[PDB]
Copies of this chain bind each other. A is one copy, B any other.
Amino acid sequence: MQGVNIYNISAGTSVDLAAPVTTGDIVTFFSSALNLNAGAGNPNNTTLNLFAENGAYLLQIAFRLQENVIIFNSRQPDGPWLVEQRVSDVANQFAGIDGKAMVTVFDHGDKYQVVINEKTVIQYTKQISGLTSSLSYNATEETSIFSTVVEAVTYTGLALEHHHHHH
């Protein structure tokens, strides 16, 4: 059945989900601040990650102000970072809303749709499949583009399909 779980993630920490995020599920990270002028990343200012039980980075959303880009990538816990998908102009993706923001990730089975506020910035074809068992928000107090603590809200058990058969 459908359920809502709330997690308050401090910068530099991660949490295990009470209910895994799977195909048809949604997770939204809410930030109470938007620091588009934060310190220089190294090279990341902020990273939002969806982890598989084996620690694989199912999806990482990395924000880089200096390089002015949002990187989407995946990799096994002991494997190399895979093919990066980039979105230029970090500020433009958040335009329209200041002092706060939200990043939503839809798990569509074959792809991860990421939406910054109301704007879909990418339909990311998965490079690694599997259910998300933990989330993380990594950054330092001085260079994060988001608030010290980011609230993650997962909407699980959502999957709804209408099967139409033909022959």
A110 CB to closest chain B CB, in angstroms? 12
Contacting pair B160 A4 (CB below 8 A): no
A67 at the interface (CB under 8 A from B): no
Q: How many residues of A contact B (CB 8 A)?
A: 32
Given A102-B153, A166-B165, CB of A160 within 8 Å of CB of B118? no
Bound Cα distance A162, B26 (Å): 18
A24: chain B residues within 8 A (beta carbon) = 158, 160
A interface secondary structure, majority: strand
A94 at the interface (CB under 8 A from B): no
A166: chain B residues within 8 A (beta carbon) = 163-167
A23 at the interface (CB under 8 A from B): yes
Interface residues of A (CB under 8 A from B): 1-6, 23-24, 26, 28, 97, 102, 104, 106, 108, 113, 115, 117-118, 120, 153, 155, 158-167
